[PDB]
Design a protein around this ligand. Structure first.
Ligand code: HEM
Length: 441
């Protein structure tokens, strides 16, 4: 009935508790200690962190709670604007973009993006094939090159050519610096210059495409051709720009983290790596994988879900109460009160998953129906769930499948997991050696 709360520091309230490089990891320890719900205050502000499936299922009731723009999302809005990720649900442009873009992100739509995903995946595998004996792989670094380039190509048919560079394309450098700055705020001159570098490139590409009239298999074509069924209006060019920025911003780091954490768990669990590699070998019988083959990589799909269980790479989302309501028969909330869903803790709820929650066991997902509703939420909730979910999973399944077909892997440093936190999670300094199986690529 009365809510637990961690240590306060006078007027600073709980804020100093998050004065750390790893705040989600600190929050998980507070959840370990305090249980399924705790109050957390800062000077301007109050939230409640939820960790149990029992309470989070109620928080996922869209008649009662809607997505909140957290402080992080308000800072990111300085360059992401009213794109899908940083808009309120009742903003006109949220509904308009959601209606136009939804079918373009369906599983069916992945058939159209597949060729460009494969173009970048082959670049990754060729890079590793071309390493000499004395060399290792920087895993998150290379996964980030891959996901950035894939979203650039599928998003607006632009090649960042990350596998041709030590220093990223200047748009990437500006984007990464811009995110870092907004996360650090939780400079001003540089922030503005980086916003400008981002808008100018994206605005140019939109302008070039409208001029040529070329039709391609990318999201920019769908957005130029789209009309909202409700209002009948297309997106304007400004909003199209914010969406392109958002796909890069919302998508690249989470998908790179997922691939990195999956490879981490596979090298730490060689029996699981072997079962996954055996599937990859049986299924991916052609030098270039087909869309239908990726669909047949069931166990690789399970590996990815179990990596998302333990370390969901967008680990928290924020909600507000639409009206006064009582949570779990115990905790009265007022209209506008905010809740945070602490996804890594939810995914450790022993009442759902059994006592072995820290173990990496992809077989938990053998029968996707046996997972209770709202027990597994790495892509958020309801109409404000990740629009990129099918894209992320097709990309990750394709690339992991190819990695497992083409190489044997060695954890040559006996790497110790260190999770770096920004807007996303990543296994910092994770490195491996890959020995080629010398299979036609
Ligand atoms: C494993 C990779 C990914 C994870 C774990 C992930 C996670 C999430 C989560 C938890 C949300 C909800 C945020 C909130 O409630 O505040 C979200 C929203 C969103 N994501 Fe993803 N994401 C991933 C990949 C992608 C990719 C590849 C794209 C684009 C190509 C993308 C685009 C978006 C967009 C536009 C939204 C906002 C949707 C809306 O509210 O209409 N994400 N993501």
């Amino acid at each position: 009935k009365e809510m637990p709360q961690p240590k306060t520091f006078g007027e600073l309230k709980n804020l100093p508790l998050l004065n750390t490089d790893k705040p989600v990891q600190a929050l998980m320890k507070i959840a370990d200690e305090l249980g399924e719900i705790f109050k957390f205050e800062a000077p301007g502000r109050v939230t409640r962190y939820l960790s149990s499936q029992r309470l989070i299922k109620e928080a996922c009731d869209e008649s009662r709670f809607d997505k909140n723009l957290s402080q992080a999302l308000k800072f990111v809005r300085d360059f992401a604007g009213d794109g899908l990720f940083t808009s309120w649900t009742h903003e006109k442009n949220w509904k308009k973009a959601h209606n136009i873009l939804l079918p373009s992100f369906s599983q069916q739509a992945m058939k159209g993006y597949h060729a460009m995903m494969v173009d970048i995946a082959v670049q990754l595998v060729q890079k590793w094939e071309r390493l000499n004996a004395d060399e290792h792989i920087e895993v998150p670094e290379d996964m980030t090159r891959l996901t950035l380039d894939t979203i650039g190509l599928c998003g607006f048919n632009y090649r960042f050519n990350s596998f041709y560079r030590d220093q990223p394309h200047p748009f990437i450098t500006s984007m990464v610096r811009a995110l870092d700055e907004a996360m650090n705020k939780l400079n001003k001159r540089q922030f503005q210059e980086d916003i400008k570098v981002m808008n100018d490139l994206v605005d140019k590409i939109i302008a070039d495409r409208k001029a040529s009239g070329e039709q391609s298999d990318d999201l920019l074509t769908h957005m130029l051709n789209g009309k909202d069924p409700e209002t009948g209006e297309p997106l304007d060019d400004e909003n199209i720009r914010y969406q392109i920025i958002t796909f890069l911003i919302a998508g690249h780091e989470n998908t790179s983290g997922l691939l990195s954490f999956a490879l981490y768990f596979l090298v730490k669990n060689p029996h699981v790596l072997q079962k996954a590699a055996e599937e990859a070998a049986r299924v991916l019988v052609d030098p270039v994988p087909s869309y239908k083959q990726v669909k047949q990589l069931k166990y690789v799909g399970m590996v990815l879900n179990e990596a998302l269980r333990l370390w969901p790479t967008a680990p928290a989302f924020s909600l507000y109460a639409k009206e006064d309501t009582v949570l779990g028969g115990e905790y009265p909330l007022e209209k506008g009160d905010e809740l945070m869903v602490l996804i890594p803790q939810l995914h450790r709820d022993k009442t759902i998953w059994g006592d072995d929650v820290e173990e990496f066991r992809p077989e938990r997902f053998e029968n996707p129906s046996a997972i209770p509703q709202h027990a597994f939420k790495p892509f958020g909730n309801g109409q404000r769930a990740c629009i990129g979910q099918q894209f992320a999973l097709h990309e990750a399944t394709l690339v992991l499948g190819m990695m497992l077909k083409h190489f044997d892997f060695e954890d040559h440093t006996n790497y110790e997991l260190d999770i770096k936190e920004t807007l996303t999670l990543k296994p910092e300094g994770f490195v491996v050696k890959a020995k080629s199986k010398k299979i036609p690529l």
